[PDB]
Design a protein around this ligand. Sequence first.
Ligand SMILES: [Mg+2]
Ligand SMILES: [Mg+2]
Ligand SMILES: [Mg+2]
Ligand SMILES: [Mg+2]
Ligand SMILES: [Mg+2]
Ligand SMILES: [Mg+2]
Ligand SMILES: [Mg+2]
Ligand SMILES: [Mg+2]
Ligand SMILES: [Mg+2]
Ligand SMILES: [Mg+2]
Ligand SMILES: [Mg+2]
Ligand SMILES: [Mg+2]
Lengths: 394, 107, 131, 61
Amino acid sequence: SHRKFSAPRHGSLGFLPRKRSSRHRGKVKSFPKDDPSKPVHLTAFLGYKAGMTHIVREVDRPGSKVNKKEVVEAVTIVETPPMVVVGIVGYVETPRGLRTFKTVFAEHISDECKRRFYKNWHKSKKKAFTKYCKKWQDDAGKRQLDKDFSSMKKYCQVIRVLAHTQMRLLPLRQKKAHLMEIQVNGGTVAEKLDWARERLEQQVPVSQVFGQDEMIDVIGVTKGKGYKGVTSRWHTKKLPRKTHRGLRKVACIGAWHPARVAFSVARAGQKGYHHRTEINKKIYKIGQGYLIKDGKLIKNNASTDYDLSDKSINPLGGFVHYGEVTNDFVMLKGCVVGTKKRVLTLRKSLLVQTKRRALEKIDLKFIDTTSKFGHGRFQTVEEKKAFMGPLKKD
Amino acid sequence: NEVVTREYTINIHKRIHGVGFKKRAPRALKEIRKFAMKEMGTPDVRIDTRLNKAVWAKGIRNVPYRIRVRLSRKRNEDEDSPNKLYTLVTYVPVTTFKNLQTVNVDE
Amino acid sequence: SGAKFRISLGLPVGAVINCADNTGAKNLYIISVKGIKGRLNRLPAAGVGDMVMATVKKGKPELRKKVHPAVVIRQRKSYRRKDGVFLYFEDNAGVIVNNKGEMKGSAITGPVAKECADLWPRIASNAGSIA
Amino acid sequence: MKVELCSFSGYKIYPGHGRRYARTDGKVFQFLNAKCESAFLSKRNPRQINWTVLYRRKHKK
RNA sequence: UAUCCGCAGCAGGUCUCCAAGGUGAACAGCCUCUGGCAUGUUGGAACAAUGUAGGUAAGGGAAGUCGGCAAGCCGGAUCCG
RNA sequence: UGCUUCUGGGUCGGGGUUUCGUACGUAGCAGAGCAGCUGCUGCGAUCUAUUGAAAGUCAGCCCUCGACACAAGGGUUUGU
Ligand SMILES: [Mg+2]
Ligand SMILES: [Mg+2]
Ligand SMILES: [Mg+2]
Ligand SMILES: [Mg+2]
Ligand SMILES: [Mg+2]
Ligand SMILES: [Mg+2]
Ligand SMILES: [Mg+2]
Ligand SMILES: [Mg+2]
Ligand SMILES: [Mg+2]
Ligand SMILES: [Mg+2]
Ligand SMILES: [Mg+2]
Ligand SMILES: [Mg+2]
């Protein structure tokens, strides 16, 4: 007989293979589509999650209850040093899909990227690309190289540049860099190839990829949570207290006559550490890193034009479990996937965005930098000491 | 070079944080032995009864947060034993664990 | 014009709240909350500024044993104003109105939440204090 | 944004933190955190608790 | 809780004597001395799900359920009543 | 994920942060009062000063560039 009282499904079947990700960093499943009209540029970049923070701004949307009021909005900090480019890959489109035509690497590759090529760097003799790098200083090697470039120019359709992160500019424990392919979008294949090969082997910052007050997509792996039951992986209702053989279960696993149990019935297993992507995450700020000039270290990242203090983005005691954000960073709205210290892919929006909340201009008024390692009361150490006075230890 | 005595302070709070009440002192001894065999390169570590009493002084679930110990690596007297060197671990009663570096105490 | 945002609602069906007016009632017993679509095994609950159906459990006889429309004035559950503050009152209290927002009494004892005062202009006029 | 003072400890409350508590007789208070909240609800005099500002100012510390 | 009966070194059963200190109305419960013992037919490493035995939960307060089942509230003494 | 660019991680120590709430001792003509000796000496819960003090703080917090030792090792396989 039928289910007497209807009720919607628990969970979504669109994320069904609810298994551990085969990858640690998110892979861009689809890059933004190309058009030759726009100038050439990049479409994705890679950062690291640091922590979350308060923000105070003034809303500007007519007809709202909070028009020209001031609201607080949680934000996510993604520390993001400039990448460095090490290679170019061309793709040719086929009736069977899209296959790699040819790959060209740079003359000099840092040990940061070399570490990615070994699963035991301590024991290795570090021979990656040692015989390849001689193709660059040889006349025959370089003429074969430009033959490769011309072949890519006249046979390939989409161009992806290889870039890796700089792990020595981060407080993280690992020294093995992250390597990625980023699609070059813009003009024709010749222009894209010239652009990629004229800044091959050098650095690319974040402000050249993403602009302030823009809505992007975030890709990454969620937090792992181990083996979990149906009542927490699928959020089914708990059974009453009187149940004999356990109450954190789902009672009916299926009807009789379909003599199997379907793919759609909630079962216990791995929760979290899945690969996810979230769309429409808006950028409030692109802050530069600590820099040096005249022997004085300028650091006032979190300084707004309504505050005029010299506090940096780092709260007192640093970001918990992560460290200190000394180089460039971006500030997205809300929460992103993944835990602290997690690598995190950022990409341009796919769909065109013409809507009011997509075209609001963001002007910040206050950035809270109280200690997150407990209930913090003071924004800066100077403020703390001025309020408290001299201590015994002083 | 081989026969040598040094002294350290051990953060038992850190090394046994998170364990059950009835297993704290035994794991305190296990962690002390592991620390001794990691510092002095020998698998044979023996602990004085005075140090055992010091670790067990406050009971089974309340253990001192830090202990000052002396590690003495010395050659094994019983020649037929496979191990050439052993490490005696002794208790050092202190008043404050402040600014106490590891000290190369000499003979 | 501007609509009310979502708030941390904390008054399910069956909640008994105080009556902050001079109509003669002393308790409201919430029987249902207007505007609720519902879900399986999901108690319809009301936040501040919401209009509910209630009944009087203690009060003068002529206004007992029947259903009255009411508006929730204060709640003990702390709710988040979009300014970033979390506000909660000492008691859960409401007033009895008609179907179109006119209040049956003439004065309100105690403060009135800003959301309710904005949504119901007749409640705000008789509200002595606010927020 | 304006910065307001904790009704119990006298500390300085920033926009994101704290809670605000209105009584039946009006007289809205604001509290920095749940420690101050619980002390206020338990009806303790701030002049007697060492870590607040009223105590420090009345003892000239 | 191993010399008896129960197929067994079986959480069952099997008639009596003696009986310290403190708290406390008390041979109640809790801590100790005389006397006894080695955790009850094994140990080591971790701390997933589901369990068994305990706890705590904002706002509401039986709306749950056949049914307040279960848990929770109350608790001693003195003075009123 | 890490495992010699005098570099590295590791331990300990030191700062930052943060939790609770003002330590022991000493001094007080502060202290309901009581005892003794002719104002002093004793008992006395509590209070005041030293004292936002003392204690804890990554084991899954943040920086150290202080001290100490250690790290160029071991084993099993893989051929176009
Ligand atoms: Mg149906
Ligand atoms: Mg049963
Ligand atoms: Mg925190
Ligand atoms: Mg139902
Ligand atoms: Mg046992
Ligand atoms: Mg045993
Ligand atoms: Mg036995
Ligand atoms: Mg509750
Ligand atoms: Mg409650
Ligand atoms: Mg019923
Ligand atoms: Mg029912
Ligand atoms: Mg019962």
